[model samples]
Target: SNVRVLATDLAFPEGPVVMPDGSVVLVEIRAQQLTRVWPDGRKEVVAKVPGGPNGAALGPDGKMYICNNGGFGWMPGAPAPHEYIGGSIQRVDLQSGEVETLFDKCGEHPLKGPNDLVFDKHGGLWFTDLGKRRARDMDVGAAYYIKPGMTEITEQVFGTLPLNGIGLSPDEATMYAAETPTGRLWAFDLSGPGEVKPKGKPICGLGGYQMFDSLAVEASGNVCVATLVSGCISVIAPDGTLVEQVPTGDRVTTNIAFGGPDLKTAYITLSGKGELIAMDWSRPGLPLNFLNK
Candidate 1:
């Protein structure tokens, strides 16, 4: 209820990562660049990341890693498939603004669309490939895992519906993902890094035509998912119970991150309207593996 506008006029902003210096770094998919917004609402360019930069997180090495969803066709009405350049993972140096492509293809298949990513305590990365959507056809989505400074990336879960948001439980025992079209939040048990036990299922689903996007986890172990169409952050307990929904008044409420000194500040991206907003979260967020440590 105490939400405040932090920045406006962004070009379809998505992945919001809170920096240590009180600034928020996010990607403008349509703008094809990584930008930083100061606490006072000033903006600056962090780096030029071509294609659709979807989700982002700070790695243990202090560099920013990004999920590039290739390019899309954003016409006057709704977005459609455009140039379709393919997707890849990228790393950016915060100080030098240097961008490097980490992985464009996992094994034999190319990454269709890298959507969101989160790092575990062991410095391994967990991400989702939402796949690209065309007019009549779409690619199948999957989940992936890669260790720190590793060249090989393993597909953890394959042949899934388009997965948008991804995060780990507070104890790193469970992995959660938001399926886009179905509005389902899925839970996967983790035996170890990149190793998932067979108990995967939809923990909860939004009843109506609501869709799910990127997400963040709370310190209380609840998953806070950005719901589309309904335009709210849906908080669900690990046990699949709906906790609450925080409305944002934007149909394209895409992503969320936590910051502030006490980690109770919620920074959200209203992509459809091209605005970034912040609000006081009721509970503190689960501190990220390396960034908060």
Candidate 2:
């Protein structure tokens, strides 16, 4: 009645986007591939992206956009519990499999680790560069705005923010983001194309390793952030209030997206136990018309 193990074997799968035809598209960052899973369990290898693809979504143009972290340092055979590696955003044409770079670096350094992305009503892509730090002391996470055309991208927005997951309110008037290590959610107002203004301070106060990863917006203007260390989905009302918290019982709840027939069911990625769980969303999710309407 909820969700079965849609696919048993996934190599660090993060992003999950449902397509118009009832198919699902996801990214396997560890495997560096974009995969599509049809409603019938038919699996198809879409693209072989070399980087660590953290998030995958479809834009209005019908092309699949990806958050590519150039490379993760660890070796799989010598696996570690939680691996943080890679740093960039990429996109691929669905029909032809033609790939292209969206944004990887600012001017000199790489874009830390591009984690998740969401599109606005204006056909522009808003992403989060979850900048990573190494022994060398590097700052890797920040928010970004990819303008209307595929050619131009600001790459970094509000240098002060170490943003991870990103999304927009149902009406596109508000843009929301999450800061990882700090476990706080940030917000900004959509001024215009590539223009956004900070609304206020982060909703989630700084504490623990509960920063956020992926995000989803309910029809009623609620922002549901998939928390990292907190092991729950933090729901924030538009009025800047913490409304509800959905516990997954798994400490590693990675990401969440709206799927199912009415576009109201939330399909969540529970990496801790390797399962995709579905919840009956109280309200409908915003229709990403390009991907599903």
Candidate 3:
């Protein structure tokens, strides 16, 4: 209930990654660049990643990895004036601002709209392809993983609803994903890095017109998913219960990340309003694989 705005005038921001130096790095999808926001509300451009740089995280090698959704066609008041350019996983040098495409396709299928990603303890990356929607048709989304320093990308889950947010349990034994349209949260058992077991289940679902976006895991094993339309962070317990909903009063509350010295600061991106806000959390967030350490 004590949410406070940190920055504003962003062009549809998402993917807030708290840095060690007390700054936050995020992607303004409509701006098509990776940006940094300081604690004092100052902003800087980290890199001009031309495509829709949707999700970002600090890799094990101390660089930034991005899930670029190529580009997006937008409604009025949005930034992009073009169509979807395609999608790819990109690597960026935070210092040099060099962007390199890592993978744009898994086998024969091209990534339509790669949304969010989370790194595992093993340094492997798990990500979601939300897919693109057109006036007449839309593409199916999938979950994927890439090994540390490897070129081969593996498709872990496919042929599903538009999967938006991807995260991992504290023990790294389970993987979680949110379906955008259905507002369903899914849990998949993991046998190893990028290896999903034979079974998975929907742990929770939202009622009414709410939709799901990106998510971050709590240290208590709760999945905090940013729910669209509902404009709140829906906290789901590991046992498939709705714990609490933290409202931000913005319809497009796109993503969340934990920061601060104790990891209790919840940095949220209110994308539609182009603002980043922060609030104290009840519990600390699960330390992300690469960045936290």
Quote model 3's TM-score.
0.96
Which one is best on lDDT?
Answer: 1
Predicted structure 1: lDDT: 0.89
Any residue pairs clashing in model 3, and if so which? none
Q: TM-scores for all candidates?
A: 0.96, 0.87, 0.96
Q: What is the C-alpha RMSD of each candidate to the true structure, in Å?
A: 1.6, 3.4, 1.8
Q: How do the residues 57-96 of candidate 3 rate in per-residue lDDT, one tens digit apiece?
A: 8898888899988788662122243656679999889898
Worst 10 residues of 3 by lDDT: 75-84
lDDT (10s digit) by residue, model 2, range 23-68: 6788876778888877676788788888677788788778888988
The C-alpha local distance difference test score for the whole of candidate 3 amounts to 0.89
Model 1 over residues 1-293: C-alpha lDDT tens digits? 58899999999998999877769999999899999999887999999988888899999888899998887777212235456677999999988889999999988999988999999988899999998876677788799999766557999888788999999999898999899989999999999876789948998988989999999999999999999999999999989999999999998999999998778999999998899999899999999988776
Indicate the residue-level lDDT of 55 in model 3.
95
Of candidates 2 and 1, the better by TM-score: 1
lDDT of each: 0.89, 0.73, 0.89
